[PDB]
Each structure stands twice: as C-alpha cells, then as structure tokens.
Amino acid sequence: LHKEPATLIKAIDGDTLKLMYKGQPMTFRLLLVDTPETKHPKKGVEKYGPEASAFTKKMVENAKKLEVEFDKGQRTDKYGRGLAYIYADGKMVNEALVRQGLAKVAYVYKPNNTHEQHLRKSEAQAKKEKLNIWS
C-alpha cells in the first residue's frame, strides 16, 4: 500500500469527505469504520453523530498535509465514492475516530481489510476505556 496526496475541499460527515485527488473533486468514504450519522431522514441525527463529524472536520481542516491510501480491493463503492484510509499529518483519521469511541469497526470486505486488526485493537481499547459510544 502507498500514500498519495489530496487536498481538502469539504468535510461532510464523520466518515465522508470531499477531496481533490489527482486534480479531480471526489467524495471519499472512510474504509472500515462506521460513525454515527448526522444525515438521513431515515434515522435522523444519531447520538454522537455531531461529535464524530466535528472530530473529523477539525482533524482534516487543521492538517498541514492530507494523504489517501487505497487498500488492495475495489477503490470505489457503488455510489462512486473512493474507499480509502485517510491520513492527517501522518495520523490515520480512521483509527483516531475508533480510538476515541466515536466510530465502530465496520463489517469488513476482503480484500479491503489491511488495517483491520490495528483498528479492532484501538476499538477494544476505547471500549475498555468506556469512551463516547462505549460510555
């Protein structure tokens, strides 16, 4: 796996970003994590949804550098969203959310599961610490 640069256009939700990648504007979905949603009329603003969204937003907006890292499987989902691990100043946004109890590890689709065990370890720790959704 390798990292490539991207530029923030817009943070949309806890787990969805609009980036400029290879000169094109693109929506990215964070791989392997589910954050509570702010969107949807069919749900509403779920609990911690707003918190997860502010966390993702500040972490990507305050970064000097953003990088995207595709996994080994498909790189877009059926909605045309890029599927990637996102890094802000070298720190993985997907892991940060999980480590804070602001996201669960998603149902996983091989072969797009390279950082699966890393994330599940951060998730067991946030659980252990009873943070946010594990409160």
From Swiss-Prot:
Residues 115-131 have a biased composition (Basic and acidic residues). Ca(2+) binds at residues 15, 34-35. The active site is at 29, 37, 81. Residues 115-135 are annotated as: Disordered. It is found in: Secreted. It comes from the Bacteria. This is Nuclease A.
